[PDB]
Each structure stands twice: as structure tokens, then as C-alpha cells.
Amino acid sequence: GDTGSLAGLQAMADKIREMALKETALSVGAQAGLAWRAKIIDEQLNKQARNLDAIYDFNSLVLEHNILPPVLLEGRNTLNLADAQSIRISDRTYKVAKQAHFITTPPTWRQYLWMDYVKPEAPKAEKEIWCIYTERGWKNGIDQANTILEENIARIKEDFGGMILYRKLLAMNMVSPPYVSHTDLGVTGDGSEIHIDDRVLRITALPELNVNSAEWRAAVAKDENALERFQAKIVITNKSWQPIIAPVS
Amino acid sequence: GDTGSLAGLQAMADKIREMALKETALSVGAQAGLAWRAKIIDEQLNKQARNLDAIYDFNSLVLEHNILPPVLLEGRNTLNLADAQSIRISDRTYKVAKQAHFITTPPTWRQYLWMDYVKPEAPKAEKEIWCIYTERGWKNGIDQANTILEENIARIKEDFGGMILYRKLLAMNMVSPPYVSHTDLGVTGDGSEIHIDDRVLRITALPELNVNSAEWRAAVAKDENALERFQAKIVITNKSWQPIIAPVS
Amino acid sequence: KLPCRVDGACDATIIKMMTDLNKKGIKVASVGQNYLISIPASALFADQSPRLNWASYSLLNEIAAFLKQFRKIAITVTSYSSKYVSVKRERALTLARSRVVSEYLWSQGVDSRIIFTQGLGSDKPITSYTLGGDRSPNARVEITFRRAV
Amino acid sequence: AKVEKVITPPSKDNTLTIPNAYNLQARASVDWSGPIEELTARIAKAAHFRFRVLGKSPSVPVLISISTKDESLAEILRDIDYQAGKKASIHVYPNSQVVELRYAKIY
Amino acid sequence: FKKPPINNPSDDATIKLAEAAVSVSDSMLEMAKVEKVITPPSKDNTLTIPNAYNLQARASVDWSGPIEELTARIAKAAHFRFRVLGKSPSVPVLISISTKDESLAEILRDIDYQAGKKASIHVYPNSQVVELRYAK
Amino acid sequence: KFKKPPINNPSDDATIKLAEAAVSVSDSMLEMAKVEKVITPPSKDNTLTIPNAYNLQARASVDWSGPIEELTARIAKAAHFRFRVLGKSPSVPVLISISTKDESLAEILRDIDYQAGKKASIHVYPNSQVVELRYAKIY
Amino acid sequence: GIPPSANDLLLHVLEGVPPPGSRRLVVSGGDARAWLSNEKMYVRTNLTILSPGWLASMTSADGTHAYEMQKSPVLLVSWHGKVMQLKVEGL
Amino acid sequence: CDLTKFRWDCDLPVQVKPSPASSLLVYCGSSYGYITKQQYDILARYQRASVNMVLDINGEYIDSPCIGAER
Amino acid sequence: GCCSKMGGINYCDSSAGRLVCNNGFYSTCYCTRHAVMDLQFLMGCCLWHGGVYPQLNSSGLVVCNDGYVSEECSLQ
């Protein structure tokens, strides 16, 4: 007897009635399978906790004043068939899904990817097809947990990619940096309470995509050839590794 | 026991009562026969799927700006007997059944010719003529499926032929081409969302049959004879293949 | 309610037919997803001619079944042969052989969008033993492809 | 087809824009019903020609469907160019071994 | 023993269907052949690869914006000077190049093609200069 | 028999999805790094501010995900360098996360300085044997 | 006036995030994901949709399409020059 | 080159500058050199044969793929 | 089983949707519903018309989501 394993769930029990049996078996199987798959997903995430920390390093993308950069969404080849006789096309659209804000701690991958787990304590056409339908429900719950994890991954990827895209656009002068001003009060207070070095930080200008296309700055990378390098026996050599299955198309 | 075959339908059971038996047998047979014939029609369409794609190639008829050409219907030798002492005759009539519009994907033959298939589950003057009348209903359902497929073929033929007729009439200058205008906005948007290359396509003029008969262009084909060609032993020879059943009229 | 495997293909079947072709003498190798079927031209054609023997059609049928066991986008049928008369001669002969094998394989409908054909004549041998005609080791037909997904 | 050819006969053959050459005479039997660019890239790769693309690919794809059997890659590229028509154009430069697909300047 | 094609039309109606498909495809090809307008290579108004050594260098560009900035950056990467002849339009000439491995000469060819008749690009290798010629 | 070389242990679809997302993130990071480097290439190396010396060539394998100051102090103590701090430590900690394996203490200090960036800066004076961490003059 | 640019939810669909306040659909037979939000269908896929016909589209950097269309229980797609179908359930 | 033997081993010197004699481009990966007309022809022959033609300098591999370019 | 005459099922590769067997060879068997299947025969009413409109039927008519009525599914 165990709800944390399909074996124990099956061993628990070792047209209207048939349909009710199928429905209840699917219902009990789905929740147990979803919980077990969430547990295994959490185990995998904790196994790769340091790698996930290296990958989704929100701390390195944080701006100067501990400001979370905005999330920028990009789409290309945009088309909208408004109706017959009217379409609207655009080469690229950039959008600010989330705006920059002051933060006190960088976000972590656990806020996105963690999968909530609680062990669910719960209980011919009577306990013969019940096993087959509870196995079907277990598979359905596993699939549901996988879909939830996939959505969580998509969300964290969207956020991290938006911050990276903001950094790239700021490099290319397609967004303005957040402008923050400090008001520097002296020693502030009265005889009951004083604050020594009182400073008030305020984002006076949020980052925003600039429409002055003249101000943008393109970046062209390059790859290094034999320029300025070259006994200098520059030779195109046949003697080399040759693939076994050569003409694959 | 099977609803997907007439053999299974008949094996299922191996004046008022007589009439009720006939009616119910016809009703059960018709649906099963129609479903089975729809399945076989779909199998044949999928067998000839590539040939159907070659024939009904709506993609090759698509106009410049991804515009579906209008469907033109043609009739000849028109006569209408309005009443006694009044008829109206006309040599040819051309009509625009459907007008041109922007499209995003070319139409396919499946939208017209596909036959919906769902396996229909269902159950002396008692089970003796029941098989005879269920066979009659099976034949009736097969005929109904064939008629539905015939109507679908007629519809796809009308649409494809109307598009081809539009192309022909445009060649002979009996229709005007659709006129599309592009409004070319620059970089459009504000600090929250920008679009790089904003263009608005609008069909400012729909195609229409022009009544200026002076502007039409006739086309006369020809067949090549021995002109400008011809030891040159031009000869009418008896020695050749001769039909066995020669004077057939 | 949904197919459990690609229709008409089995892993035991693939292994059995690879073993059988290798036993016969047709080299069926697989490095990664890339598959190679090397066929000696002596088992397909006549002596330096692009005319298959009627007996070789059973071998071509087995190779067609093998190709049908996989899902793919493009096969490549290449022909190499020993030097007989002239560079143009073996080039034309190998192109014709590739055309004919490709036509038969295409007719025995395989799940292949493209079947490229080519013959380089005597450009890329696989053995230093060039003695012989069509019995030579490097007079062969290569059917190379990549399993799709 | 007859009436349109009579109305305006063609004047130029696309063999000028796609001049055949060696290794473009390799043959292929194709059955394709997708976007133009992938098929052209596969043809160019099998012809050992570098594939180059000009112009912005439109949002509405340039779908082509070639169902042939054993014709040379030059003929297949000519067929692809004709089927593309006003949407896309295929050129072949055999001196530089370049197959170039360019999307027309519509939009 | 040779086997017949599995997809062989061996039905009285399938054969006719297949020949009708063949004729439809042939007629469509003929119609496309008549329809198509081609530009002969001699009369092609596009930049021909300038062959300049500095311009043959490979690059990786992901740009969607004004032509002027990308052309200037490409010229500077190629070490050529850059100049503009003409008056910049009100609405800027917007282009997009998204390539991972393409030479600067080919990128300039693509830029010229996408500019079309709003602007053109000339390359002088002897006096290494990229010129963006606007149109009026 | 027929086999192909890499017969690894079974993988989970959780790890598979994480691997795909990680590869996409890595590609985005590569593109961003390349475009920023082209936009403005670096001009100065932090080896000027952290000059290596003897006993800074001691090697360490670190796995740290905390504030900068404690790791810097441990590195300095293991290098036998007196640790000094300049500037007011901000309320929001300068968190660093260094996960390396056996590189010299000078290299670790360089990595820490680069990770700190605009928040904190590490200097090393080998004449006075001083490792000095200074919190920037923001706020 | 000026028609709408496109649906901003297509950016979230591109990223793989379901549009807010939507329900999942079960796409079988290929690599695609579908969500139903406002009696419309949003599909993330690497394939090309041919038959059903979409209302709006966006393309991501690496070549992933986000389609906004009307709901349809079948999607005709071209995988690699091959026309197959994806069965959309949950409509 | 010797194109048939068994291993088709051969050698093609590369001239970096676009000399009048050797002005035909070869893109060895990201590193490009210039060769002659006969050299381009035989390299294209090897490309048709689908043989890897990695670029070697002083016996050291630099870049794998060779593809002919504008003449 | 699926990977028969190979070693056996190693694991389901969800990135490709197929099984990977104990030898390096993939498996013809699918393991996720998102594996590329050559689905060409799809059951169901009102295909290519938006699917069946979810209304409580007063007659046997099956009406699709675009208004077209499916005569092949309607009651007779």
C-alpha cells in the first residue's frame, strides 16, 4: 500500500458501473503520477542545481544600481491579415514585456523551474480493468507534469532571453539605459530618530526602445583568415581524415 | 459483431411490425454504408494525393501579392422566357462568384474533396427480411456517399475552373487585375514597442469585368503545316496501318 | 489511437536484413545516423555495361526493402568502376548505372523525397587492388543516406 | 495555356539565368511539397554549389511542389525557378559555383 | 525477379487520372514559362562581387535598420573608406541582413539588392571606397 | 552485432528539456557577447590591477555562491596576503558565484573582479602583500 | 484607418509561454504546441502550415513559427518536403 | 594531383595575394587563399568526388572545408 | 518488444520523439506523441471546416465551426 508508486497504487486493489470505474481509476492515477513525476523533476533540478545556476545567472545581468533589466521580446517577419484587402507586415517587432525595476536580490531559477510536490494521501468491472485504467492515469499524470515543467522552462527562457536581448540592444543603441538620480540628504531627523547618511535613489527615466533609427549602431563580426600571418608552406592537403559515408545530402 | 461491414451488420442479428422493421433496418443500414463508403473514398483520395495536388494546384494560380484570383462563372446561349411575349437572350454571361482577397496559405484539395469519417457505433417479420432491408440501406448509404463526393468534386472543379477562367479572361483583357497599394511607414512605435519596417498592403481596387468591349484582345491559335519547311519526298501514302472496322459511322 | 512505430519498419527486421546483406556480400555499414550500402557491380550489372541481370532484381528488391525500413529525405546513389576505355566512357557508364538503380529504387517506392544520382567513373576507389574489370573491389554502387530523426 | 501563349509568347528562356555546367548534370528524382529554400539548398549541396540567398524572405512562404523523376539538377532548378515565378528567382553562377535564390522586391 | 511499381496505375480510371495530372502539370509549367519575366545577366542591375581581398573576409551580421549604418560598418570592417552621394530620404531605407557566415562582398551585394532603386552601392578597390548612391 | 560508440546511461526528459533550453541560452549568450565585443572591444586587462606574484601561484578549486568579501578574504588568507576593504559595503550584497577547478589564486581573483564588475573591484599589491577589495562609489 | 500590427501574444507563443488566460491543446503527430485563448489557436512549430490558413504569424531568430489562426482539429504541415498532418485535440 | 591510385593524395600550394597568374579564390573554412585555373579545376574535381581538402600549414591542420569561389 | 534483437530499450529521447536502444541505433518506435508521424488518415467530423460546433443538437444535423453542415455525419 503506497500512493507514491504505481506498483503500490495497483497493489491497493489486488455501462454505468464500467464508466464510473474508468473515471475514478483515471482520476486517482493522474494525481499520483503527476506528484511522482514532479518529485523526480525536482530531483533532477537539484542534481543540476549548480549548472542551472551557471546558465540562468540573473545576477550577472543586473544593472548598475541593482536594477533588473527589462524583458524585451522580439519577432520577425510579422504579418497580420487584418481582413480581405488589408495586411500589415513588419520586418521586426520589439516589445517590453516587463519594465526595469529596483531589486534587492537577483531572481533564481527555482522561482521558475521548481515543481511543487506534496505526497497525495488518498485511496470484469471491479478491480480488473481498474489496474489498466490507473496505469493509464499514471501515464497521463506523468505527461501533465512534463508539460508543466516544459512551460516553466519556456517562461524562464523567455525572461532570461529578454534580459540578454536588452543587453544586446543596449550595446547596439536600440534602447536607452535607465536613468537613476540620487537625492543626497544630510543627517536627517529630529531628537527622537536620526539617519546619518540619507540617500534617496529614484529611477527618473525607465529604459525604452528608441525610434530614432539613425542613432542605432550596427555590429559586424569577422573571422580571421591567413591575413598578416603568412617556411609558410600554405598547402591544401588531401592527406587527412576522410568520412566513411562521404556523399550524404 | 461489427458496424464497419455489411457482413457484421447482418451477423448482428443471425403490417405495423413489418413496416417498423423495414424502417429501422433501412435507417441502420444507411448510416453504416455511408460511413464505410466515405472511408473508402478517403482511402482513394489519399492514394491519389500527389496527383490531386498536381491537378488542383491552387498555389500556381495565386497572384502577385499572395492574392487568390476571383472565381468567374461562364454561361453561353442564355435564354430566359420571362413570360409570354417576352424573352431575353445573350451570347455569353460572365459572373464573379467570389471576389479576390488576400490569402496567407494557398487552398488545398482536401478542403473540398475530403469526406468526414467516424465509425458509427449503434445496434417472418423479425430478423428474416431485416438482413434484406439492411443490405438495401447499405446500398442507399453507399449511393449517398457517392453523391456527396460528386458534389464535392463539382465544387472544387467550379472553384479551380473559375480561377483558370479568370486567368484566361485577364489574358484576353476581359477583367482588370487587382490593384494593391503599399503604404510604407518607417520605424513605427513608441518606447514600449517598435516595428522596424512597417508596411501596410491594401487592395485599393478589386478585379472586375470590364464592359468596354473595344479593349478586349482576341487570341487566334494556329497549327503548323509544311509551310517554310519543304529530298523532300512529300507524299500521300496508302501503305500504312488500316483500321479493321473501316466504315464506322 | 496513435501509431506506436513508423509503419512497416521493425528493429529486428532492420538487424536481420543488415546481417543478411552483409552475409551475401553487400556491405551495409552505419556510422552515426549515416547508412552506407556498397554493392559490387558484378552482383548487379553485366561486364562494363549498364544492363542489370534479371537475377539481380531480387537483390535490388531486398535493398528496396531495406531503404523502406527507414524514414529519410535524400538518398544518394553513386557509381564507380574500373578504367576500361576512356574517362568519358566510364563517367557515362557510371551515370547510366546510377540512373537505372535509382529508377528501380524509386519505382519500388521508398520514403525518400530526393534520390540523387551520380557517377564519377574511376575517381574515388576504396582499394589499391585495381586488377580486374567489374570484379574489381572498387567497381561498385554506393547507396548512402541519413536516417531522418 | 494556349490562349495566353498566343496573347503573349515568351521571349526569354531562363537557361540564361541558370546556365548548366558540369556537376549540374548530376540527376535527381524529387518529390517535394515545401518551401523553396530548403529544396534549393539540398539541390545546391548535391551539386557541390555554395547556396546564397538574396532579399528578405516573405512572411507568406514561397511554397513549391516538384514531383519529377530523374532529371538533371539544372533542369530541376529551372523548374523551381519557373514555379516560383514572381515570388522568387533562382540563378546559377558556375564560375563561382554559386546557386543563388533571391526573393523578389515585393512589399 | 523484377517487380512492378507499387504506385503503378493499373486501374482503368487511375490511369486516366494520372495522365490528366501529367497534362495539368505540363500546362502549368508552360503557363509559368510564359508568365515569368527574367533579367539576362548582361542587363542585371545588381552589384557584382567586388573581388577586393579585404572585402572577401567572412563575417556574421544580424541587422535590421537603416542602410547607411550597416554599409558604413561593413566598409569600416573591410578597412575601406565610406561615402554617401545624394540626399537621405525622410523615411529611411530599411534593410535586414541575418547571416552567420557570409563575406562582406556578398553582404554588400545583399544590401544593394534590398535597397533596390532607392539606393545603390558602388565599390572602388583601386581607391578602396564604398559609395552609397541615393536615388531621387 | 551492430553498435554505435556512445551508449550512455538513460536520460530523463526533464534533463532533455533543460539541455535544449540551456543550448538556446548559450547561443543567445554567444551572440550577445560577440555583438558587444564588436561594438566596443576591451582595452585594459585587470592583470594590471591584480599583478600576479609568488604565493599567488598557489592553486585552488572553488565552489562559492555567496557574498564577495568572505571568498576574497579566504583567498587572501590562503595566499598569505593581508586583506583590506575600502568603501562602504552596500545594503544589497555583492554576490558572486565562482565554480572552478584548480586554477591559481591570481586567476581566481581576476575572475572575482570581473564577476563583480561595477559593484566591487579587487586589487593586489605584492610589495605590501595586500589583497584589497573596494566597493564602488555608487549611492 | 491603419490595420492592427499583429497580436502581441505571438511573441509569448514564440518564446513558448502560453498566452495569458488560455488553455492547452494536444497536438499529436509532430513537433508543435497549441493554445486556445480567445476562440483562436496559437501554434508554436518548426514546420510550415499549408492548408488550414492562419490570421497572423511571427518568426523567431532560429526559425520557429508562431501562428495565430482560427481553431481547426487538423493542421496540414510540410515536414521536409513531405506533407503530413497533426491532430489537434482539446478544441 | 594523383586522383585515382587508392588514397588520391595530393598537394596544392596556395598564394595569399591575388597574383595575375593565381587569382582564383579558395575558401578553406574562414581562411581564404588564391590558386590557379588548373588548381581550381582539380580542386573542383575533388569536390565532385567529395573528398575532404583540409588546409595545412607546415603540416598543421588549420581549416577543413574547401569550396571554389569567384574566378 | 520494440528494440528487439538489439540490446533493448535504453531510453526515450523526447527531443526526437523516438526510443534509443541499447546499441547506438535509434528505434522505429515512438515514445512521445510529438514524434514525427506520417499521419494522413484522421477520423472525425467537420475536418477542414473548423471541427464540430459544440451545441446541444435539436436535430441530427452536425454543424461545423464555419457554418458548413457535415452531411456525412448528420443523422438521417
Which residues of chain B have a CB within 8 Å of the CB of A73? none
DSSP I66: T
Phi, psi of A236 (to 5 degrees): -95, 100
Q: With left for phi above 0 and alpha for psi between -120 and 50, is residue E25 left, alpha or beta?
A: alpha
C-alpha triplet G70, G73, G75: angle, nearest 5° = 80
Report the SS3 class of residue A209. Answer: strand
Contact criterion met (CB below 8 Å) for C123 and H45: yes
Helix, strand, coil content of chain H in percent (nearest 5):
15, 35, 50
CA dihedral B51, B52, B58, B61 (to 10 degrees): 40
Contact B54 E65 (CB under 8 A): no
Distances (CA, A) of D73 to C77, C116, D56, F91: 15, 9, 25, 69
| Buried-exposed string B129-149: b where 16+ CB fall within 10 A, e elsewhere | ebbebbbbbbebbbebbeebb
Task: Tell how strand A179-184 and strand A71-83 pair up.
Answer: unpaired
Sign of CA dihedral D19, D24, D26, D31: negative
**Inter-chain contact C148–G81, Cβ cutoff 8 Å?**
no
- What angle, rounded to 10 degrees, do the helices at C56-68 and C11-24 form? 150
Is there a contact between B144 and B30 (Cβ–Cβ < 8 Å)?
A: yes
Residue A14 and residue G19: Cα distance in Å, rounded?
44
Whether B186 has its CB under 8 Å from any CB of chain E: the answer is: yes
Cα distance from N-terminal residue to C-terminal residue, chain B:
56
Which run of H or E residues covers position F95? strand F95-99
Phi, psi of E2 (to 5 degrees): -70, 140
Strands (E), chain B: 67-68, 71-83, 86-98, 101-102, 179-184, 188-189, 193-195, 199-205
Write a three-state SS string for E55-78.
HHCEEEEEEEEEHHHHHHHHHHHH
Which among D57, G11, A89 is positioned nearest to B188, based on CA atoms? A89
Q: How far apart are CA A160 and CA A153, in angstroms?
A: 11
3-class SS at E101? strand
Residues B145 and B38: beta-carbon distance below 8 Å: yes
Residue B104 near residue B96, CB atoms below 8 Å: no
Quote the distance between the C-alpha of residue F102 and its chain's center: 13
Q: Where are the beta strands (DSSP E) in B37-178?
A: 67-68, 71-83, 86-98, 101-102
Closest CA to C114 of D47, G45, D99: D47
Rounded Cα–Cα distance for residues I20 and I7 (Å): 10
User: What chains are in contact with H, requiring at least 3 Cβ pairs below 8 Å?
Assistant: A, C, D, E
Question: Residue E44: how many CB atoms within 10 A of its CB?
Answer: 12
With contact defined as 3+ CB pairs under 8 Å, the chains touching G are A, B, C, D, I
- Contact partners of C by the rule of 3+ C-beta pairs under 8 A? A, D, E, F, G, H, I
**CB contact (8 A) between residue D8 and residue E96:** no
**Distance between CA atoms of residues B115 and B39, nearest Å:** 7
Angle at CA of residue A231, ends A230 and A235, nearest 5°: 70
Non-local CB neighbours of B102 within 8 Å, separated by 6+ positions: A81, A84, A85, A86, A87, B65, B66, B67, B68, B201, B203
* Cβ-defined contact of A85 to B206 (cutoff 8 Å): yes
Q: Is C125 exposed, middle or buried (0-12, 13-18, 19+ CB in 10 A)?
A: buried
Set of chain H residues whose Cβ sits within 8 Å of the Cβ of A232: 57-58
How big is the CA angle at F94 (ends F89 and F95), to the nearest 5 degrees?
145
Resolution expressed in Å = 3.0
Helix (H, G, I), strand (E, B) or coil at C92: helix
Grid coordinates given for D62:
514561397
Alpha carbon of residue C93 to chain centroid: 16
Amino acid at B96: V
Q: Give the separation between CA G85 and CA G28, rounded to whole angstroms.
A: 9
Q: In degrees rounded to 5, what are phi and psi of residue A132?
A: -65, -40
CB atoms within 10 A of CB C133: 14
Question: C-alpha D64: how far from its chain's center?
Answer: 10
Report the alpha-carbon distance of residue E65 to residue A218 in Å, rounded: 9
Top residue of F30, F38, F39, F40 to mutate, by most chain E CBs within 10 Å, is F38
C-alpha cell at A35: 506528484
Instruction: Tell me how far apart the alpha carbons of residues D37 and D41 are, in angstroms, rounded to a whole number.
Output: 6
DSSP string, I17-62: TEEEESSS-EEEEE-STTS--------BTTTTTTSB-----SSS--
Is B55 within 8 Å of chain I by CB?
A: no
Q: I11, F1: Cβ pair inside 8 Å? A: no
Closest CA to A95 of B129, G9, E46: G9
Q: Residues B1, B11: contact at Cβ < 8 Å?
A: yes
Grid cell of B185 as nine digits: 511607414
Is I in contact with D (3 or more beta carbon pairs below 8 Å)? Answer: no
Per-residue CA distances from A149 to A38, A113, A140, A155 (Å): 8, 7, 14, 10
Do A248 and C124 make contact, defined as CB atoms within 8 angstroms?
no
In chain A, the residue whose alpha carbon lies closest to the alpha carbon of D107 is: A89
Distance, in Å, from the CA atom of A31 to the CA atom of A25, rounded to the nearest integer, reads: 11
Q: How near does any CA of chain E get to the CA of C59, in Å?
A: 9
| Beta-carbon separation of B50 and D31 below 8 A | yes
User: Hey, are the CB atoms on D107 and B54 less than 8 Å from each other?
Assistant: no
Q: What angle do CA D99, D105, D107 make, to 5 degrees?
A: 140
**Cα–Cα distance measured from residue E49 to residue E106, given in angstroms and rounded to the nearest whole number:** 7
Distance, in Å, from the CA atom of E97 to the CA atom of E93, rounded to the nearest integer, reads 13
CA atoms within 13 A on the CB side of I11: 13
Q: Are B103 and G53 in contact (CB under 8 A)?
A: yes
What is the grid cell recorded at A53? 545556476
> Which residues precede gaps in chain I, with C-N > 2.5 A?
none
Q: How far apart are CA B89 and CA B72, in angstroms?
A: 20
